[PDB]
Design an enzyme around this catalytic site. Structure first.
Site, PDB file in Angstrom:
ATOM      1  N   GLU A   6      -4.791  -5.710  11.716  1.00  0.00           N
ATOM      2  CA  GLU A   6      -3.379  -5.636  12.028  1.00  0.00           C
ATOM      3  C   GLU A   6      -3.152  -4.878  13.329  1.00  0.00           C
ATOM      4  O   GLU A   6      -2.481  -5.379  14.234  1.00  0.00           O
ATOM      5  CB  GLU A   6      -2.605  -5.038  10.849  1.00  0.00           C
ATOM      6  CG  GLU A   6      -1.119  -5.316  10.943  1.00  0.00           C
ATOM      7  CD  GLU A   6      -0.397  -4.754   9.758  1.00  0.00           C
ATOM      8  OE1 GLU A   6      -0.096  -3.519   9.726  1.00  0.00           O
ATOM      9  OE2 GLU A   6      -0.257  -5.482   8.795  1.00  0.00           O
ATOM     10  N   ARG A  30      20.803  -9.237  41.067  1.00  0.00           N
ATOM     11  CA  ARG A  30      21.972  -8.367  40.987  1.00  0.00           C
ATOM     12  C   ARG A  30      22.051  -7.517  42.253  1.00  0.00           C
ATOM     13  O   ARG A  30      21.082  -6.828  42.595  1.00  0.00           O
ATOM     14  CB  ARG A  30      21.832  -7.484  39.748  1.00  0.00           C
ATOM     15  CG  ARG A  30      22.830  -6.338  39.637  1.00  0.00           C
ATOM     16  CD  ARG A  30      24.241  -6.775  39.626  1.00  0.00           C
ATOM     17  NE  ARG A  30      25.149  -5.640  39.332  1.00  0.00           N
ATOM     18  CZ  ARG A  30      26.459  -5.801  39.189  1.00  0.00           C
ATOM     19  NH1 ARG A  30      27.012  -6.994  39.462  1.00  0.00           N
ATOM     20  NH2 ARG A  30      27.213  -4.803  38.769  1.00  0.00           N
ATOM     21  N   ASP A  67       5.308   8.859  -1.620  1.00  0.00           N
ATOM     22  CA  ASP A  67       4.583  10.078  -1.256  1.00  0.00           C
ATOM     23  C   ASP A  67       3.258   9.767  -0.604  1.00  0.00           C
ATOM     24  O   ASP A  67       2.427  10.676  -0.418  1.00  0.00           O
ATOM     25  CB  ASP A  67       4.409  10.985  -2.488  1.00  0.00           C
ATOM     26  CG  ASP A  67       5.721  11.454  -2.997  1.00  0.00           C
ATOM     27  OD1 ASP A  67       6.009  11.269  -4.177  1.00  0.00           O
ATOM     28  OD2 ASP A  67       6.488  12.025  -2.204  1.00  0.00           O
ATOM     29  N   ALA A  68       3.079   8.558  -0.106  1.00  0.00           N
ATOM     30  CA  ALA A  68       1.819   8.186   0.551  1.00  0.00           C
ATOM     31  C   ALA A  68       2.139   7.215   1.684  1.00  0.00           C
ATOM     32  O   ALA A  68       2.218   6.010   1.472  1.00  0.00           O
ATOM     33  CB  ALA A  68       0.807   7.628  -0.447  1.00  0.00           C
ATOM     34  N   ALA A  85       0.817  -1.196   0.000  1.00  0.00           N
ATOM     35  CA  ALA A  85       0.000   0.000   0.000  1.00  0.00           C
ATOM     36  C   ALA A  85       0.854   1.249   0.000  1.00  0.00           C
ATOM     37  O   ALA A  85       0.653   2.141  -0.854  1.00  0.00           O
ATOM     38  CB  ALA A  85      -0.993   0.027   1.186  1.00  0.00           C
ATOM     39  N   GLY A 133      21.924  -1.714  33.279  1.00  0.00           N
ATOM     40  CA  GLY A 133      23.201  -0.998  33.200  1.00  0.00           C
ATOM     41  C   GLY A 133      24.089  -1.578  32.114  1.00  0.00           C
ATOM     42  O   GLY A 133      23.624  -1.929  31.018  1.00  0.00           O
ATOM     43  N   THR A 150       6.731  -5.306   3.837  1.00  0.00           N
ATOM     44  CA  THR A 150       7.119  -6.485   4.600  1.00  0.00           C
ATOM     45  C   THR A 150       6.853  -7.718   3.753  1.00  0.00           C
ATOM     46  O   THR A 150       5.805  -7.831   3.098  1.00  0.00           O
ATOM     47  CB  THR A 150       6.301  -6.517   5.897  1.00  0.00           C
ATOM     48  OG1 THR A 150       6.686  -5.372   6.688  1.00  0.00           O
ATOM     49  CG2 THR A 150       6.577  -7.781   6.704  1.00  0.00           C
ATOM     50  N   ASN A 194       1.629   6.495  15.733  1.00  0.00           N
ATOM     51  CA  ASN A 194       0.848   6.829  16.910  1.00  0.00           C
ATOM     52  C   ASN A 194       0.271   8.246  16.832  1.00  0.00           C
ATOM     53  O   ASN A 194      -0.791   8.489  17.420  1.00  0.00           O
ATOM     54  CB  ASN A 194       1.702   6.628  18.179  1.00  0.00           C
ATOM     55  CG  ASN A 194       1.806   5.149  18.517  1.00  0.00           C
ATOM     56  OD1 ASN A 194       1.172   4.301  17.839  1.00  0.00           O
ATOM     57  ND2 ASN A 194       2.563   4.831  19.525  1.00  0.00           N
TER      58      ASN A 194
END
Ligand SMILES: Cc1cc2nc3c(=O)[nH]c(=O)nc-3n(C[C@H](O)[C@H](O)[C@H](O)COP(=O)(O)OP(=O)(O)OC[C@H]3O[C@@H](n4cnc5c(N)ncnc54)[C@H](O)[C@@H]3O)c2cc1C
Ligand SMILES: Cc1cc2nc3c(=O)[nH]c(=O)nc-3n(C[C@H](O)[C@H](O)[C@H](O)COP(=O)(O)OP(=O)(O)OC[C@H]3O[C@@H](n4cnc5c(N)ncnc54)[C@H](O)[C@@H]3O)c2cc1C
Ligand SMILES: Cc1cc2nc3c(=O)[nH]c(=O)nc-3n(C[C@H](O)[C@H](O)[C@H](O)COP(=O)(O)OP(=O)(O)OC[C@H]3O[C@@H](n4cnc5c(N)ncnc54)[C@H](O)[C@@H]3O)c2cc1C
Ligand SMILES: Cc1cc2nc3c(=O)[nH]c(=O)nc-3n(C[C@H](O)[C@H](O)[C@H](O)COP(=O)(O)OP(=O)(O)OC[C@H]3O[C@@H](n4cnc5c(N)ncnc54)[C@H](O)[C@@H]3O)c2cc1C
Ligand SMILES: [Cl-]
Ligand SMILES: [Cl-]
EC number: 1.3.8.14
Lengths: 383, 383, 383, 383
Positions: free
Chosen positions: D244, D270, D131-132, D127, D341, D160, D368
């Site tokens: 999706e 740790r 420019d889109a 898709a 760290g 993809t 987003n």
């Protein structure tokens, strides 16, 4: 997995919302302006059902679960501007009615519980002290066992409802050897010799919800006024705070729903530069944050209360909901003010007062730093 | 590159700080509680030098630069709790005294300027309208040219000092064909026929700093009361806002220095769980944020004012400083409240009042969203 | 108070910038793609002046102050994409050259210092251990005094430059009774019996800047190779970290200046929905954050280095600058990626690699949580 | 209102988790290091059920709802480190299998759908164009109607699976008069004359998930290869993006559950300064943020998918979940790195690679910022 309310739950919410709008919100602006807690109106709300929660029909209650109780309180927070009165009522329910019901003897419940559930009597919970806030089990007030009961000395501060309460649920050390295991809980009446209730101490946040200090000077507590077993006072306090954090916080979810509706309406109606201000992404991005927060914290609230109702361990869930609701209530109050600009200063609309009312939500029933400590402990980080 | 004040600048700051502490802060709590703006005290502050800024000795001023003026105002913000009075005084300086000095004719300056610089007269700046806030050049008030001057009609809102002002610096359209190029500025006296100054409108933020609406009903403005050239009113307003955003904002830097000192002292003294609460990283991390903010925004303030004094283009620097100071003032007010917990509700200490006083800093003189638009334009993102 | 560079400082910055662009940035993409640290190019940079700092002319240095040194490094960070090489060079300067100059005996300086200042020799600083990161004075490597010097055993990790170093500045306990007072510093040569330098350990961040572990198996250190006095090693390490945090961090200020210029250009050129994407406030608001951060952290950097040059206590100022620069470098890397969208995945442009290179800035020379602990201690919150 | 999975849902999650751990996660480190997408392993995952979703039994599917499909994908994200393979598989399901099932003719489904559902064939969705991107309905590729079908020209980017796909679901304008109403969708086979699939373009994020550009040079599309009606391509694309955003995003919820478990274990194990690092509130506060985020975004995900399954309008809910999951996935990746760290640089543990893999989640299927625009429109702010 299902995200609908039942018909019964929808009815509980809608009835509470109608009462909040049609009874409590009537003439709220005058009471807010004058800083009035109307005890006669408080009693009508109590008797309607806001002082009932899980109490059994035997004592005038509705046998509601935590989710049902939270829905009633959410409706109250959305429908009534008089959030100081609502906070006062919910503190009485969650920190006074519920522990007496859950831990009091038959004799104590028979004497006092129905009166508290109907609001015939107002109660205050007195735990916090000058040197025992977050570190509550450092409390120093002492209930020294003696023949026939206890001798009580000490000082409590920040006590919601103390200036208007008829009875006090007090926590004090019956064994100064221990912290948590050394606390007991007691019910004492206004007017008992040695109980000195301070004058109301004014505040800008929740400004018509009265609080004050109380001092105990050699009060005799008869044995029959102990709530629960000796030394159970820490467990009773803890349980009461689970209810307060779990259900009382719903007030601020309903208040955020109300705030978001007001804010959306303004951002559609107010124009600058030839367009609605909601068309500027600086404005809309904050409103979307308010929406995201409302949906997330309502679901966290509902799941915490549902888990409690299922008999599951909900302590971390309740700490997470109390933290998220209060953080999101404060942030959204700031965002609504930013949306309105200079128009936010209007006292009738009350956006600044709303922010003030949300500020203490990050403190009451345990600060949000303490909620993180509770969650850390549940995650194994405090071993 | 040097980060010390000169001896002269240190003396200016220290003298202003002593006046703020030893004169203005005296009996501030009573005036704050009663919501009093003491005009007699305001006049003493004006005459001390807070109404002087860059005005020349000819008119009673001190010929200070922007950095010098900002230092005096920072000291005022740190030394006096009566920030409402300080805001009122600084609005008079930055939005009224300075434009009259910079753009008024010799005749107008000779008639009014020294009186404003000594505080003999109080001034209010009237630009904002119901439909012209951020979009200020949409203002609709009209000053229609006529024989001998202008006929003025319209309505201004949110006008600091209007209830106590003797003179008004008003902006109105002399050409409704244009926005920015169509605005002129005028000085009008209290009592002129057709000038209807509204009653004070109360607010919770800066609550003793009076503001109100003003309505113009067919006011005749004599030609000699125009400030600057016809159509220069947009440029005059813009210049005044540069001064207000650049120097008035220093109030909140001084207030943050005061707040941080108070907050540090409490976090060292208050103990829970056997240690000072400042030893818990949840507590100290917020105090370090307050410190980081103070140091950053003070340097941004000083550089913006220094650049202006050097004759450089400081518009982006002033927008950045106004945005950072006000954001950091609000965030730090929230962090101080979180540090104190329930102790923050005390009205004498005034942490909640301090937050309220900082809330409008993100709105006055252009909202922080508008500051971002100014910076975006300076960065080439609005071409 | 003055915010201009001197002519000398401007010349230092511009010369370093030209060298970074015209020498080091040449063919950087090939070295970055192949993960190559070119030691021959590193040596040319060292000899140009990047290994000089405050070292005196006696040893080939430039007698620069901290501000001068930071300006050279800022220019390096803006002009060269090969930030891994720049980090390697600056670690050698700040953690190896400078302590040897400041604390080494005349004999040790005469043997090694000019070689390090010209880059004839590359050095690595070896302090961190498996069980001593933030808690550095918990280091367990031991330099046991013996006839003629010391016997050294232990393991160091995360050692920048170890795979390419000719000499090692090592910290070890000469008194296991104490922490800080029990550490001494030593210079040891590559090839000494018992010095086992590990193979390069790959990383995605700063990926061509080599690091590895080193193991000491019964190394004999002659007495003459101790740097400074017995037990001064903690003070020497601390001083070196002040220089590393103060000046090395300037790399990331220059990198942020470069990133912001790239990001501004793209937001003006890339169009969607018929306009430049910089015209959408969601996009521009992040770019304004990048600008605000750059200006604030550059001023904090400059003031910290200037205060050091004045002989003032700059420890808190350096901790604040290291924290702000690294936080702002990471946040701005995220914001640049968000500005570009899918275009950010391009490896030639390197926005994702830039974020990776900034991630360790919040860790190296003390994590940002530790910087807050340092600032808290300076503010009196750790007493 | 109920927050438990059904027995069937728990079985779906657990079976998918076991397959992810016991099949896909086997030898993942080697494939990740070598940047390998194993098509034979991808096909086994497809055939297990990851290419099925809502497809009917007629075509080899499982007739799952959106919540069921999201649970399978959440398990996949928690159980397999090879998130690049998982993303590739889920893109094929959500953007290729599902639109063909929902909109393709009987003839097209009979020819291709079962092969895609079993993974016999791999598909790519094409898709986006140079420019889109966000402005997808600005796409310029043209499918010009002609005798027998269409002539297709244009260029797609960021596709993809393009280097490994056997079939392509392509969107192009059949009417250049319109935007959204002018797009149609088509299925074209690898090897068709005029289809030029570019070489894989490397990236640091999701680095073994192949993508590339595709160019159409005068491709003839037979009429029978149009998916759905003429001009329905915008609606088909929109519907595919709902799937999706709704279900593919569950990958990152499962990845956050895995990350939080790893991070909790390290913070307990740790030690520095004599205690587990999780005992320092700077460390634990970030881990609590990770926990809060996981619980909130999982509930938002589940409600969005449940609402879709109920037949309710879930568009805003899906945009909110996609935004929250991706923001929280990136922030939590940063917080895990801060917890470890220097230990975070280890490539085997892969915390930095995990952050890289989360970065594109804020971009794919609509950035987003665009999710905020969708939510704003649903809230009435884009009228
Ligand atoms: C609106 C309101 C109503 C109230 N009603 C009642 C009531 O009816 N009855 C009653 O008994 N009490 C009541 N309280 C008091 C309330 O319980 C206390 O305010 C609360 O326990 C916090 O104690 P404190 O205010 O003394 O704050 P402190 O405990 O002094 O906390 C100060 C700061 O230190 C932080 N801090 C403390 N310990 C830690 C730690 N271990 N780790 C990290 N940070 C830490 C806190 O989070 C806070 O930031 C009310 C309070 C409010 C605001
Ligand atoms: C304490 C105080 C004192 C004041 N004193 C004076 C005074 O003495 N004289 C005077 O003339 N005025 C005064 N004002 C008014 C002040 O100038 C206006 O409040 C200010 O211009 C903002 O306008 P508004 O309040 O109408 O907000 P609006 O312009 O309605 O803004 C509402 C919201 O929309 C946003 N917004 C608007 N346009 C844009 C845009 N283009 N892009 C992004 N977001 C946008 C704003 O940022 C804000 O979030 C004072 C205000 C305050 C708070
Ligand atoms: C790029 C790079 C280059 C380096 N180069 C060198 C070099 O050349 N020579 C060398 O000797 N070392 C070098 N180091 C190592 C560096 O000094 C350590 O990474 C650093 O000291 C932190 O220790 P750590 O990584 O073991 O983290 P830890 O100390 O294990 O920290 C883990 C987490 O616990 C937190 N934490 C620990 N203690 C506290 C506390 N008291 N309060 C709050 N939070 C706390 C940390 O902030 C962090 O979030 C380098 C590191 C990096 C990333
Ligand atoms: C991992 C990954 C896989 C992908 N797979 C595919 C695939 O298989 N098939 C396919 O067709 N595409 C695919 N894409 C492409 C994806 O659809 C685009 O990246 C996405 O549409 C954004 O477009 P863009 O990258 O061109 O960014 P742009 O649209 O150029 O956006 C640049 C910036 O401008 C902002 N912006 C743009 N318009 C607005 C607006 N109106 N308001 C506010 N901000 C705005 C964006 O939010 C962003 O910050 C994939 C992308 C990624 C990252
Ligand atoms: Cl916008
Ligand atoms: Cl801590």
């Amino acid at each position: 997995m299902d995200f609908n309310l039942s018909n019964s739950q929808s009815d509980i919410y809608e009835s509470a919302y109608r009462f909040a709008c049609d009874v409590l919100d009537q003439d709220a602006q005058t009471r807010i302006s004058q800083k009035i807690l109307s005890t006669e109106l408080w009693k009508k709300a109590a008797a309607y059902g806001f002082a009932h929660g899980p109490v059994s029909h035997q004592f005038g209650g509705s046998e509601l679960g935590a989710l049902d109780t939270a829905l009633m309180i959410e409706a109250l927070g959305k429908g009534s501007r008089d959030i100081g009165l609502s906070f006062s009522l919910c503190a009485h329910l969650c920190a006074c009615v519920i522990p007496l019901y859950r831990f009091g003897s038959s004799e104590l419940k028979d004497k006092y519980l129905e009166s508290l559930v109907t609001g015939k009597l107002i109660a205050a919970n007195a735990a916090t002290e000058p040197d025992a806030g977050s570190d509550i089990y450092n409390m120093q007030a002492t209930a020294q066992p003696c023949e026939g009961g206890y001798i009580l000395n000490g000082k409590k501060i920040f006590i919601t409802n103390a200036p208007i309460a008829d009875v006090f649920i007090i926590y004090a050390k019956t064994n100064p050897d221990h912290g948590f295991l050394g606390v007991s809980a007691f019910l004492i009446e206004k007017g008992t010799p040695g109980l000195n209730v301070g004058e109301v101490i004014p505040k800008d946040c929740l400004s018509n919800c009265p609080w004050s200090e109380i001092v105990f000077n050699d009060i005799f507590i008869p044995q029959s006024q102990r709530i629960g077993m000796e030394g159970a006072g820490g467990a009773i306090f803890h349980d009461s705070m689970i209810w307060e954090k779990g259900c009382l916080s719903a007030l601020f979810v309903g208040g955020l729903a109300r705030l978001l509706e007001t804010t959306l309406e303004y951002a559609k109606a107010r124009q600058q530069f030839g367009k609605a201000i909601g068309q500027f992404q600086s404005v809309s991005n904050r409103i979307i944050d308010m929406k995201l927060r409302l949906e997330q914290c309502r679901l966290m609230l509902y799941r915490a209360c549902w888990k409690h109702d299922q008999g599951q361990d909900a302590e971390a869930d309740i700490a997470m909901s109390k933290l998220l609701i209060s953080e999101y209530a404060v942030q959204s109050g700031l965002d609504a003010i930013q949306t309105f600009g200079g128009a936010a200063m209007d006292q009738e609309l009350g956006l600044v007062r709303h922010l003030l009312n949300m500020i203490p939500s990050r403190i009451f029933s345990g600060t949000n730093d303490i909620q993180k400590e509770i969650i850390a402990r549940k995650l194994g980080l405090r071993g």
